[PDB]
Amino acid sequence: YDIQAWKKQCEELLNLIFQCEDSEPFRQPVDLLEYPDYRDIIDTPMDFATVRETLEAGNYESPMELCKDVRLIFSNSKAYTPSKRSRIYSMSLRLSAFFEEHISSVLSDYKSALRFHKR
């Protein structure tokens, strides 16, 4: 019932994500010189270094907020891909499945801890 445990669990999950070769296109803010029309399609860019930095700054109040930003990395990739078979989009699909598999217990434990706190 540890209400704060999610933070270190998210730090460790981000470490696993950075070790994954599939995260390489998503580790840093997108390259506007390589994709000059990116901001025409994507309103809110997001990347894993920004998520990690926001976590480390103490600027997430809950793992649900972190999860919303990570899911935005994947929906941006889906919105920008010219094809559902593209290399970078295929990497985002695998990485999304890995992330969802690991974040589920983090969210469940946090929500359970908050319910216990307010019992």
Residues 34-63 that bind ligand O1M (CB under 6 A): 34-35
Give the Cα separation of 12 and 8 in Å (integer): 6
User: Which string of x and - marks every residue 1-40 that binds ligand O1M (by CB under 6 A)?
Assistant: ------------------------x----xx--xx-----
Q: Are 48 and 23 in contact (CB under 8 A)?
A: yes
Give whichever of 86 and 105 is closer to ligand O1M, judged by the CB atom: 86
Q: HSE on the CB side for 22, CA within 13 Å?
A: 17
Supply the Cα-derived Rg of the chain in whole angstroms: 15
Chain residues in the site for ligand O1M (CB under 6 A): 25, 30-31, 34-35, 77, 80-81, 86, 88-89
